[PDB]
Amino acid sequence: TQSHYGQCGGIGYSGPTVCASGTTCQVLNPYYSQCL
Numbered sequence: 001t002q003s004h005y006g007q008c009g010g011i012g013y014s015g016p017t018v019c020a021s022g023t024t025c026q027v028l029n030p031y032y033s034q035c036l
């Protein structure tokens with residue numbers, strides 16, 4: 001999983017695709033998505 005405020009889904013993204021065990025993968029823009 002990702003950390004808090006980290007990335008979980010973007011066009012230029014390769015890190016953890018799931019958000020922190022206390023954070024949620026909420027999409028931002030069609031090129032960026034982060035963990036809250």
Ligand SMILES: *O[C@H]1O[C@H](CO)[C@@H](O)[C@H](O)[C@@H]1O
Pocket residue numbers: 001002003018019020021
């Ligand atoms: O995925 C989330 O939890 C993991 C541990 O269970 C961490 O490795 C990760 O970075 C996230 O916080």
Ligand SMILES: *O[C@H]1O[C@H](CO)[C@@H](O)[C@H](O)[C@@H]1O
Pocket residue numbers: 002003004005006007015016
């Ligand atoms: O979650 C923490 O680690 C991530 C990298 O795996 C970062 O993107 C994030 O901002 C935190 O530093």
